[PDB]
Amino acid sequence: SIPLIGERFPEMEVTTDHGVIKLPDHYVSQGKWFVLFSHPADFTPVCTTEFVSFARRYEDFQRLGVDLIGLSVDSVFSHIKWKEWIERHIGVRIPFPIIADPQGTVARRLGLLATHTVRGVFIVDARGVIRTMLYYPMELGRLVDEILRIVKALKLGDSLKRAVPADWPNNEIIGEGLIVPPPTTEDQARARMESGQYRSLDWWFCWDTPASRDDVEEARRYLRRAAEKPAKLLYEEA
Amino acid sequence: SIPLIGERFPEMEVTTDHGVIKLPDHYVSQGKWFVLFSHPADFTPVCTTEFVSFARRYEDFQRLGVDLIGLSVDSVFSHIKWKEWIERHIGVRIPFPIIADPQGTVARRLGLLATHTVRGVFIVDARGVIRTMLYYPMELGRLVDEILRIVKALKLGDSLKRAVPADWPNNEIIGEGLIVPPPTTEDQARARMESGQYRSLDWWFCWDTPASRDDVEEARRYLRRAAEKPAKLLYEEA
Amino acid sequence: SIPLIGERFPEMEVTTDHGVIKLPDHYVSQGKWFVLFSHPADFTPVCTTEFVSFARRYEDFQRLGVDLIGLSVDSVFSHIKWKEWIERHIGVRIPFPIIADPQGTVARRLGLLATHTVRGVFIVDARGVIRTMLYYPMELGRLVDEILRIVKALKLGDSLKRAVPADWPNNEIIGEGLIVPPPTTEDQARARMESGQYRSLDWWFCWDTPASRDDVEEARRYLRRAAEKPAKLLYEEA
Amino acid sequence: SIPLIGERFPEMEVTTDHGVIKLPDHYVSQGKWFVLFSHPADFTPVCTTEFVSFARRYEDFQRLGVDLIGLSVDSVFSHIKWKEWIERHIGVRIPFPIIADPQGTVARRLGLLSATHTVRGVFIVDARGVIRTMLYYPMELGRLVDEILRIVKALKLGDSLKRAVPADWPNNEIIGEGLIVPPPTTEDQARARMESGQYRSLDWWFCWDTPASRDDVEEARRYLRRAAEKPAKLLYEEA
Amino acid sequence: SIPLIGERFPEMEVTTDHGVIKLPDHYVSQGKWFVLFSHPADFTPVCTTEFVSFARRYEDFQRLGVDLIGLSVDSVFSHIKWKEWIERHIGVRIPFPIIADPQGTVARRLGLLATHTVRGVFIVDARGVIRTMLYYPMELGRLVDEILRIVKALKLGDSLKRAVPADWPNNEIIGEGLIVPPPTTEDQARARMESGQYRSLDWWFCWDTPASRDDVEEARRYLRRAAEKPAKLLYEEA
Amino acid sequence: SIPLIGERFPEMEVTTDHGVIKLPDHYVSQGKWFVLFSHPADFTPVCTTEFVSFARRYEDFQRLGVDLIGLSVDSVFSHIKWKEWIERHIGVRIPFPIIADPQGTVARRLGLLATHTVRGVFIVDARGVIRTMLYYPMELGRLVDEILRIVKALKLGDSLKRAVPADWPNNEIIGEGLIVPPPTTEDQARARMESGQYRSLDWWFCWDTPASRDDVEEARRYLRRAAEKPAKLLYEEA
Amino acid sequence: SIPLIGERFPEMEVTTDHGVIKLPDHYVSQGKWFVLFSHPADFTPVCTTEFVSFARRYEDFQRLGVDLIGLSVDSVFSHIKWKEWIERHIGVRIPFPIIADPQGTVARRLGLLATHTVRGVFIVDARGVIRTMLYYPMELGRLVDEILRIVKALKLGDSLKRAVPADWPNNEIIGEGLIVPPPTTEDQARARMESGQYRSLDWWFCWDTPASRDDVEEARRYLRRAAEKPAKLLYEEA
Amino acid sequence: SIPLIGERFPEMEVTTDHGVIKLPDHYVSQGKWFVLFSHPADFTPVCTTEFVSFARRYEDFQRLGVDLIGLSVDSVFSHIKWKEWIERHIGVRIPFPIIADPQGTVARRLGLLATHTVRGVFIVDARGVIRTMLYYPMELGRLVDEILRIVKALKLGDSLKRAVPADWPNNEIIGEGLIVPPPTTEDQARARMESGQYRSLDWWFCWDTPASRDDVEEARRYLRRAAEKPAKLLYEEA
């Protein structure tokens, strides 16, 4: 009963440790994308490593106009305590709201519901539309640099009217090139081939390179960060 | 209407360009994991770049015990023609089966169905259990290296009885450390804290470094490959 | 959809911070009464005062053959952290289990369930039968001594085969007297009056004083404790 | 299928031995609370004891602005004879109504109900007609009526002062007769509280002060003291 | 939804002030008829008169082998108090059981149910068969000697194999005569009319006078008693 | 599904040997009561004896403002032949209508219905409300003088605002006394005991003698007449 | 809702003024045809004229092995009175039974059922099969000699294996001839035509004259009787 | 579900071999009665003899104002060759329409429907009301002079306001007489008796002879034709 890609985020009122809000309206109203991310329970190690990782990438998400909101199946009092614990033992403050979903209404509405099954990432755009969902299970932490690549790429897609190849900006076939959406009629395929404006492998596989140098590099940065062993662990001085 | 993570893969007979087969059974009987990935239709570019990316990493999936299987809503005859085109135009041979799903029976059965919504990666273990799902939209290519990180961390987790923190093996808090599953009783938590046998931040956040440097370095190789600019694009050398 | 007094405690399996148990079986197969008490959420102040008051009366229940089990709509990880907080800050160990009931499954099943409606005390005897149920609002703490007085009285009425007057052992009409359950036939009602064996107000109001001086003193002890201001508040030396 | 705490008391027109009345309306209209209490049947000894016990605390109930209303599964004519019997044989006048529920309609509506033994249940309902507490003692166990007085005093104080009330109040082990500030539910609300410096505190979510007048506190403590004390002079002797 | 004449009296257990009994069984087992008579409520004046009326005629009923049983919407306790008061203030002991029907289950079952509508007399024969029902409203007391007349005429009918004319034993046409059930065939009718064993007005209207002078004087006694103003009223000698 | 005492008599059209009529309206229109009395079939002996009994008392009914109406399961043609036979052979003329109910539609609407079951007297007041029902089985003739007593008694309690005791006007407790309906409040009962206006046994048992001596003696003549052995049987007279 | 030609007569127990019988078995047992004819009510003049016409044709019906049975919506008692009347006033005894169908159960079951629609004649053969049905309205009496012609012609048909032309034995084309039932196949038609064994208008229209001269004149005799002005009206001789 | 007597003929549009007409409107519009007669199939001999007898009487029906209409389960094209064969081989033109009812749509609507069951005669009056229905089986030809007797009697009953005795105009009781519809109240019964305006056997059996001598002989003429052996058969003039 999980929403589909391309569907508006189910209309709902939710309670967070920052107050009551309506989703997706609260983000739509501010012209924001949001990433809603779900966890089975407070005071859990894997999820704690994700909150901290999202927290460290907070400016990267604001820079793209993206808000973060968590969801956990525990009361608003535990959420506050858990957050306090993180800032106190880890030294990292968690600035995003957490939905307090005891009773599991929000999870059930979202099709995530056990509780072990309450995982799940919704990437939602500024029009309220679910654009991507990832469901890593509770024993596997998210790779948060990929979420950042995803919204950065969806945003370049929307703005440049382009589809994005596997492993962009390091596609093995066309590199950092972006794909021109394919023709759907024969006159359109013909006009595109006579047009001679795009690099081509077939009438259904034209591309160009319209992303700017910074955008491409912003997107390699995310992946370099995923790829490098950190200098300095936080357990060292915590 | 998707299968939830944690559930068996739905029992089904399917027709592929390699022959007729039962899922999950055909991979279970081989003690093999499989990554099942879907596509809206043949002779589409974002999908082609994905097949090609999967095909290039194919020995990396063999090494891990993972068989690859495609799904497109188009006939066996299209699938074979689509493949030959890839071999002929890009010089990469696609070695894995694709399910011929015209009519969308398999897709509807998996909750994916439109056709634009026909996307999705099921990562399924050798007992035929769904361990992770990823839904990227048709306009965004998959990051195939993160599929590799995912199965490798998950097989790692299984054989070590450990959870895996965000961004592993480059987690900001514990690096390449792996998480001991949190105690669920008071006695069990007492005893953990008396044992002094793990590095600890609280009774619910213990860890250690039980993975071999082969394991850690193989998982970082994938993220690294993901982050590197290719030397020699396939469209040039095609 | 709550149980009625006089019915079996619903058959169910439940997770507590001491582990999985079957209710009412786990207590029944021991010859123990148990009191199950419910709470909206962890780290809430009224409920904490209740845990403490229960904890302070622990031996009193043991001596009456009564076990205490709590219920809160939060995860076992929260339970255990809330517990440690109490012992650390108030300096009382909470010796009893608390049902981890996120999703509110147990509460729904007992008709308690929004979330604040999760309050309520069940007093279940050693045959599994709900004997008494109290429903205090979350903004009002229970009178724990009244709970002791209920089981003492019930155990007495049960063993001696008598009903127990309002305010017993201090009833304004008959004091520490216990009522003979009234006759339901006219034969019986005449036999009882010609027998001249009870003090009497009418064939339907007959009583005697069958309880020992030790049982009566025990029950006044509960009520005196409820009545007196404690010398030494726990908040100071904390 | 009981009503739930926090739910409005079910609209119903009932017949009592003082006449026909609409609930919660009759009481709400006067800005009064009521305590509704329930009974399997007339001329039963356990119920007669609670009736008398309520009668004796009847002025304590009026000082708190609370009306008392009984329910029993018998006709009005029995309710009246029962009352006359109590007044005659025990020498205590029963001044509150008792709803006549022959046939069980009201009892079924409140979900109390060859049962009837199950017709018990005390609904403490406030002046906005909202159910605030319910208690289910079995037929074989009289209610501690002083504890009902305690609950209404405590609940009226919590409301007027905007406080939660601790276990065993006014004799809580941790904070005695202090009253709890409703906990904060946001991050800023929680920091702000702990910045004000203005409550005694054990954590952001456990704060309290002592705003109940000393008459409030001592009034709630007599209830308990009375409950605990041996009566000088029983009523059956006197008769 | 009342059982009809000729139908078996509904099987059921009821609680009386004489104890629990089974109907119609308890009476059938003994070869006794019964007269169930119902009332809206205890300590009501019409019913009180009717009870006293039945009690005074209790021997008459015993001599016909008819037990009596009352039904009222009030408790066993109330019933017993109502009976003591009748005995104390009217000086008449009420010797038969009254069904305690709190909740009105029994009355609901016999179609009597509000509560005013709980009126109604069932005349039940030794075979468990409802033979006559009368419905006086609560403001009108029954005429109890017509019930004696009723069972006495039915017992004579049963046993003489006869139907009983209006007003018997004082019918205007045939007096104390009794009706032969009419033939239902042309052969039966011809044969009868040739038998000349009966007095006759037509083939469908034959009778004789087979009841004893005792049986006829007994029935007349009940009507005479109905018609006579009692010398001495019970309110007087009270 | 027989109507209840207290309900407005079911609205209907029926056909009788005097023509078509609307019930209850035809009688409400004239401020008249009516007595409807049912019978299995025409040319039956017990029923004939009852038609005749009603016919000799017809003036008594007129005198009370009560009309009479039969119902029998047979056609209008048989009704009329049956009435002619009665007047010709018994020499008594039947003045009142009989409903033709072939099909048994009217009996069915009234719950009477086989056909042996088609017995039943409804006494319906002038506002169309069913006041009393009797169901004598088809082998026992009614006592028509009791039907007269009942309507005289009901009319007197209506006009005087009183209830009528058992056996009135020969009640054993209070003779021709009539009952003041019991008070329903503690207040109303206190005021009434105070007032000194009624003779009294308890607050719920109050009475006076407000019926005129004429009305008393009129009600007693019905019963006297039922008790009298007739001079002159009609079978001989014929 | 009426059964149709060729169906077994509905199985049923019915009460007649001759006693209780089972249809059709009662006639099947005797190898007898029956004619059942219905009437809306007793003491009605058209049906009286029909009963008299049947009665007069009784010996004629019996010689064909036809029993007669009536049905009227009235009681057995009315039926017997009605018949008494016919023999007394007309001088004709009615020998066949008549079903007492008060309530109209039997007629509703036959689809006849107002009551004015309770008309209709069923001709039922000795196997219990409805062979013919006639629905004359209440105001139009049957031509009973046509019923005699139908069962006669039907019986010759069955036994001679032969269809009967319109107006038999006076058909305008073939007179007293009978039709050989048509061949239903090409072969069977050629064969019938090659054999020259039948008079013939076409292969579908073959006929012979196999009926006896007594059989033909018996059928003409019923029609001669239908045509003839009676000598002696029965009301004159009445 | 066949329609019953006195119901309006079902409203419907039918195709015949004279064109598309609406029933019963086509005939109501002319103020004509119609006789509708059904046949299982074309080219069948009993039906052909019935057509021929209808066409011979066609002017007899016209003088009564009766139209004829046939029904058969075959096509217009087959009906037309059937009529042609009848004219050609029998020397008789068939003048009336035959409804082409292939599929058996009209037969089903009318309750006739196997296929052999499609048989049946509806006599329908100038108001479109069904007055008589006749159901002869496939192997038994209708007696058409009896259909004339029926309409003539029926049209006479309507005009003279009289019921028609059995066998009219040769009824054994009252001969050519017609019956006055019976009185249905006791007043009309007596009024009729005392008025002396009718010959009479009892109040319900009153008759006169209003039929004109020409009506009577017309009706006997039909019956005389039905009884006369034809000299000259139509098969021998072929």
Side-chain angles (χ1 to χ4, degrees), chain A residues 42-44 74-75 77-78 103 108 113, chain C residues 41-42 44 74-75 77-78 103 108 113:
Chain A
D42 291 17
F43 299 101
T44 36
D74 255 319
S75 67
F77 319 103
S78 305
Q103 269 235 251
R108 233 170 260 126
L113 247 195
Chain C
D42 292 3
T44 53
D74 262 307
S75 63
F77 316 103
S78 268
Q103 291 203 250
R108 222 169 267 138
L113 247 191

PDB file of all heavy atoms in Angstrom, chain A residues 42-44 74-75 77-78 103 108 113, chain C residues 41-42 44 74-75 77-78 103 108 113:
ATOM      1  N   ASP A  42      13.448   4.721  18.386  1.00  0.00           N
ATOM      2  CA  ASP A  42      14.450   5.506  19.148  1.00  0.00           C
ATOM      3  C   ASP A  42      15.501   4.667  19.886  1.00  0.00           C
ATOM      4  O   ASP A  42      15.214   3.532  20.254  1.00  0.00           O
ATOM      5  CB  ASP A  42      13.754   6.359  20.176  1.00  0.00           C
ATOM      6  CG  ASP A  42      12.925   7.487  19.557  1.00  0.00           C
ATOM      7  OD1 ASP A  42      12.630   7.433  18.341  1.00  0.00           O
ATOM      8  OD2 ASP A  42      12.514   8.420  20.304  1.00  0.00           O
ATOM      9  N   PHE A  43      16.683   5.269  20.141  1.00  0.00           N
ATOM     10  CA  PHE A  43      17.789   4.651  20.882  1.00  0.00           C
ATOM     11  C   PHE A  43      18.326   3.424  20.177  1.00  0.00           C
ATOM     12  O   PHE A  43      18.586   2.411  20.798  1.00  0.00           O
ATOM     13  CB  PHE A  43      17.455   4.411  22.341  1.00  0.00           C
ATOM     14  CG  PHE A  43      17.135   5.695  23.095  1.00  0.00           C
ATOM     15  CD1 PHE A  43      15.830   6.057  23.351  1.00  0.00           C
ATOM     16  CD2 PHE A  43      18.155   6.559  23.524  1.00  0.00           C
ATOM     17  CE1 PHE A  43      15.523   7.296  24.044  1.00  0.00           C
ATOM     18  CE2 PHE A  43      17.882   7.744  24.183  1.00  0.00           C
ATOM     19  CZ  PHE A  43      16.542   8.110  24.468  1.00  0.00           C
ATOM     20  N   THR A  44      18.444   3.512  18.858  1.00  0.00           N
ATOM     21  CA  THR A  44      18.934   2.425  18.026  1.00  0.00           C
ATOM     22  C   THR A  44      20.168   2.879  17.226  1.00  0.00           C
ATOM     23  O   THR A  44      20.182   3.990  16.689  1.00  0.00           O
ATOM     24  CB  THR A  44      17.837   1.865  17.092  1.00  0.00           C
ATOM     25  OG1 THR A  44      16.996   2.958  16.645  1.00  0.00           O
ATOM     26  CG2 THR A  44      16.950   0.780  17.853  1.00  0.00           C
ATOM     27  N   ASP A  74       7.968   6.059  18.009  1.00  0.00           N
ATOM     28  CA  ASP A  74       8.238   6.260  19.405  1.00  0.00           C
ATOM     29  C   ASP A  74       7.664   7.622  19.716  1.00  0.00           C
ATOM     30  O   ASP A  74       7.384   8.390  18.777  1.00  0.00           O
ATOM     31  CB  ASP A  74       9.739   6.197  19.675  1.00  0.00           C
ATOM     32  CG  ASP A  74      10.159   4.891  20.349  1.00  0.00           C
ATOM     33  OD1 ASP A  74       9.447   4.402  21.246  1.00  0.00           O
ATOM     34  OD2 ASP A  74      11.206   4.339  19.994  1.00  0.00           O
ATOM     35  N   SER A  75       7.424   7.934  20.986  1.00  0.00           N
ATOM     36  CA  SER A  75       6.777   9.216  21.307  1.00  0.00           C
ATOM     37  C   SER A  75       7.687  10.429  21.118  1.00  0.00           C
ATOM     38  O   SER A  75       8.888  10.316  20.858  1.00  0.00           O
ATOM     39  CB  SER A  75       6.284   9.209  22.741  1.00  0.00           C
ATOM     40  OG  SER A  75       7.394   9.181  23.657  1.00  0.00           O
ATOM     41  N   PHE A  77       8.400  12.627  23.345  1.00  0.00           N
ATOM     42  CA  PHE A  77       9.333  12.668  24.496  1.00  0.00           C
ATOM     43  C   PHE A  77      10.613  11.835  24.325  1.00  0.00           C
ATOM     44  O   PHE A  77      11.703  12.367  24.599  1.00  0.00           O
ATOM     45  CB  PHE A  77       8.619  12.444  25.813  1.00  0.00           C
ATOM     46  CG  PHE A  77       7.300  13.161  25.888  1.00  0.00           C
ATOM     47  CD1 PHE A  77       6.078  12.450  25.723  1.00  0.00           C
ATOM     48  CD2 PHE A  77       7.263  14.548  26.023  1.00  0.00           C
ATOM     49  CE1 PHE A  77       4.853  13.109  25.715  1.00  0.00           C
ATOM     50  CE2 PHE A  77       6.007  15.234  26.039  1.00  0.00           C
ATOM     51  CZ  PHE A  77       4.795  14.505  25.866  1.00  0.00           C
ATOM     52  N   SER A  78      10.514  10.573  23.885  1.00  0.00           N
ATOM     53  CA  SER A  78      11.709   9.805  23.503  1.00  0.00           C
ATOM     54  C   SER A  78      12.530  10.489  22.408  1.00  0.00           C
ATOM     55  O   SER A  78      13.759  10.435  22.473  1.00  0.00           O
ATOM     56  CB  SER A  78      11.370   8.422  22.957  1.00  0.00           C
ATOM     57  OG  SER A  78      10.586   7.732  23.888  1.00  0.00           O
ATOM     58  N   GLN A 103       1.720   4.196  17.952  1.00  0.00           N
ATOM     59  CA  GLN A 103       0.483   3.801  17.291  1.00  0.00           C
ATOM     60  C   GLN A 103       0.786   3.453  15.828  1.00  0.00           C
ATOM     61  O   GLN A 103       0.006   2.717  15.193  1.00  0.00           O
ATOM     62  CB  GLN A 103      -0.534   4.937  17.297  1.00  0.00           C
ATOM     63  CG  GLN A 103      -1.531   5.031  18.447  1.00  0.00           C
ATOM     64  CD  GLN A 103      -2.966   5.051  17.883  1.00  0.00           C
ATOM     65  OE1 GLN A 103      -3.667   6.079  17.916  1.00  0.00           O
ATOM     66  NE2 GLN A 103      -3.386   3.903  17.311  1.00  0.00           N
ATOM     67  N   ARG A 108       1.713   3.209   8.737  1.00  0.00           N
ATOM     68  CA  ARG A 108       0.703   2.330   8.165  1.00  0.00           C
ATOM     69  C   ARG A 108       0.125   3.026   6.946  1.00  0.00           C
ATOM     70  O   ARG A 108      -0.110   2.377   5.924  1.00  0.00           O
ATOM     71  CB  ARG A 108      -0.408   2.080   9.195  1.00  0.00           C
ATOM     72  CG  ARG A 108      -0.701   0.634   9.439  1.00  0.00           C
ATOM     73  CD  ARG A 108      -1.621   0.455  10.617  1.00  0.00           C
ATOM     74  NE  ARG A 108      -0.865   0.074  11.817  1.00  0.00           N
ATOM     75  CZ  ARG A 108      -0.921   0.724  12.990  1.00  0.00           C
ATOM     76  NH1 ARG A 108      -1.743   1.801  13.167  1.00  0.00           N
ATOM     77  NH2 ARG A 108      -0.168   0.273  13.992  1.00  0.00           N
ATOM     78  N   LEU A 113       4.005  -0.479   7.073  1.00  0.00           N
ATOM     79  CA  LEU A 113       3.556  -1.330   8.158  1.00  0.00           C
ATOM     80  C   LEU A 113       2.290  -2.026   7.718  1.00  0.00           C
ATOM     81  O   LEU A 113       1.286  -1.331   7.555  1.00  0.00           O
ATOM     82  CB  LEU A 113       3.251  -0.481   9.402  1.00  0.00           C
ATOM     83  CG  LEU A 113       4.067  -0.553  10.679  1.00  0.00           C
ATOM     84  CD1 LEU A 113       3.248   0.133  11.768  1.00  0.00           C
ATOM     85  CD2 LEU A 113       4.472  -1.976  11.106  1.00  0.00           C
TER      86      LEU A 113
ATOM     87  N   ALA C  41       3.088   7.193  27.142  1.00  0.00           N
ATOM     88  CA  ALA C  41       4.437   7.428  26.546  1.00  0.00           C
ATOM     89  C   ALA C  41       5.461   7.462  27.644  1.00  0.00           C
ATOM     90  O   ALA C  41       5.144   7.835  28.781  1.00  0.00           O
ATOM     91  CB  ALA C  41       4.513   8.755  25.742  1.00  0.00           C
ATOM     92  N   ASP C  42       6.698   7.159  27.277  1.00  0.00           N
ATOM     93  CA  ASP C  42       7.818   7.212  28.194  1.00  0.00           C
ATOM     94  C   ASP C  42       8.261   8.654  28.499  1.00  0.00           C
ATOM     95  O   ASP C  42       7.938   9.589  27.776  1.00  0.00           O
ATOM     96  CB  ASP C  42       8.995   6.424  27.570  1.00  0.00           C
ATOM     97  CG  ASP C  42       8.754   4.854  27.470  1.00  0.00           C
ATOM     98  OD1 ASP C  42       7.645   4.313  27.825  1.00  0.00           O
ATOM     99  OD2 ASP C  42       9.731   4.147  27.037  1.00  0.00           O
ATOM    100  N   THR C  44       7.397  10.774  30.713  1.00  0.00           N
ATOM    101  CA  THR C  44       6.289  11.639  31.084  1.00  0.00           C
ATOM    102  C   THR C  44       6.192  11.678  32.629  1.00  0.00           C
ATOM    103  O   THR C  44       6.557  10.720  33.338  1.00  0.00           O
ATOM    104  CB  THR C  44       4.976  11.238  30.329  1.00  0.00           C
ATOM    105  OG1 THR C  44       4.703   9.834  30.504  1.00  0.00           O
ATOM    106  CG2 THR C  44       5.120  11.571  28.841  1.00  0.00           C
ATOM    107  N   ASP C  74       5.723   2.752  23.619  1.00  0.00           N
ATOM    108  CA  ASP C  74       7.083   3.143  23.212  1.00  0.00           C
ATOM    109  C   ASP C  74       7.895   1.860  23.134  1.00  0.00           C
ATOM    110  O   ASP C  74       7.374   0.788  23.483  1.00  0.00           O
ATOM    111  CB  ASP C  74       7.723   4.140  24.185  1.00  0.00           C
ATOM    112  CG  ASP C  74       7.597   5.591  23.719  1.00  0.00           C
ATOM    113  OD1 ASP C  74       7.965   5.929  22.595  1.00  0.00           O
ATOM    114  OD2 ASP C  74       7.183   6.448  24.483  1.00  0.00           O
ATOM    115  N   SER C  75       9.134   1.947  22.627  1.00  0.00           N
ATOM    116  CA  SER C  75       9.878   0.775  22.211  1.00  0.00           C
ATOM    117  C   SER C  75      10.612   0.211  23.454  1.00  0.00           C
ATOM    118  O   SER C  75      10.801   0.918  24.448  1.00  0.00           O
ATOM    119  CB  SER C  75      10.823   1.128  21.055  1.00  0.00           C
ATOM    120  OG  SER C  75      11.829   2.103  21.452  1.00  0.00           O
ATOM    121  N   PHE C  77      13.648  -0.166  23.767  1.00  0.00           N
ATOM    122  CA  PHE C  77      14.852   0.663  23.941  1.00  0.00           C
ATOM    123  C   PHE C  77      14.558   1.916  24.736  1.00  0.00           C
ATOM    124  O   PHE C  77      15.334   2.232  25.617  1.00  0.00           O
ATOM    125  CB  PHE C  77      15.573   0.928  22.606  1.00  0.00           C
ATOM    126  CG  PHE C  77      15.679  -0.299  21.749  1.00  0.00           C
ATOM    127  CD1 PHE C  77      14.834  -0.479  20.647  1.00  0.00           C
ATOM    128  CD2 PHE C  77      16.556  -1.303  22.071  1.00  0.00           C
ATOM    129  CE1 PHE C  77      14.929  -1.645  19.862  1.00  0.00           C
ATOM    130  CE2 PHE C  77      16.641  -2.446  21.313  1.00  0.00           C
ATOM    131  CZ  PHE C  77      15.846  -2.634  20.213  1.00  0.00           C
ATOM    132  N   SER C  78      13.403   2.541  24.523  1.00  0.00           N
ATOM    133  CA  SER C  78      12.948   3.704  25.323  1.00  0.00           C
ATOM    134  C   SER C  78      12.645   3.369  26.765  1.00  0.00           C
ATOM    135  O   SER C  78      13.137   4.022  27.651  1.00  0.00           O
ATOM    136  CB  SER C  78      11.705   4.357  24.696  1.00  0.00           C
ATOM    137  OG  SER C  78      12.178   5.362  23.837  1.00  0.00           O
ATOM    138  N   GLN C 103       3.118   0.834  17.927  1.00  0.00           N
ATOM    139  CA  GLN C 103       1.925   0.450  17.168  1.00  0.00           C
ATOM    140  C   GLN C 103       0.682   0.291  18.063  1.00  0.00           C
ATOM    141  O   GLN C 103      -0.410   0.036  17.539  1.00  0.00           O
ATOM    142  CB  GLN C 103       2.117  -0.900  16.496  1.00  0.00           C
ATOM    143  CG  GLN C 103       3.099  -1.003  15.353  1.00  0.00           C
ATOM    144  CD  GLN C 103       2.753  -2.209  14.448  1.00  0.00           C
ATOM    145  OE1 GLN C 103       3.487  -3.229  14.426  1.00  0.00           O
ATOM    146  NE2 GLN C 103       1.604  -2.116  13.739  1.00  0.00           N
ATOM    147  N   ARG C 108      -4.827  -1.554  21.926  1.00  0.00           N
ATOM    148  CA  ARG C 108      -5.976  -1.612  21.033  1.00  0.00           C
ATOM    149  C   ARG C 108      -6.796  -2.795  21.382  1.00  0.00           C
ATOM    150  O   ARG C 108      -8.031  -2.727  21.412  1.00  0.00           O
ATOM    151  CB  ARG C 108      -5.523  -1.774  19.599  1.00  0.00           C
ATOM    152  CG  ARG C 108      -6.284  -0.934  18.655  1.00  0.00           C
ATOM    153  CD  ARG C 108      -5.616  -0.965  17.347  1.00  0.00           C
ATOM    154  NE  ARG C 108      -4.684   0.135  17.195  1.00  0.00           N
ATOM    155  CZ  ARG C 108      -3.464   0.026  16.655  1.00  0.00           C
ATOM    156  NH1 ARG C 108      -2.964  -1.160  16.252  1.00  0.00           N
ATOM    157  NH2 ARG C 108      -2.724   1.127  16.547  1.00  0.00           N
ATOM    158  N   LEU C 113      -7.484   2.191  23.181  1.00  0.00           N
ATOM    159  CA  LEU C 113      -7.146   3.045  22.048  1.00  0.00           C
ATOM    160  C   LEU C 113      -8.123   2.716  20.916  1.00  0.00           C
ATOM    161  O   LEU C 113      -8.286   1.485  20.756  1.00  0.00           O
ATOM    162  CB  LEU C 113      -5.786   2.608  21.532  1.00  0.00           C
ATOM    163  CG  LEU C 113      -4.492   3.361  21.556  1.00  0.00           C
ATOM    164  CD1 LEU C 113      -3.517   2.536  20.647  1.00  0.00           C
ATOM    165  CD2 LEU C 113      -4.618   4.883  21.152  1.00  0.00           C
TER     166      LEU C 113
END
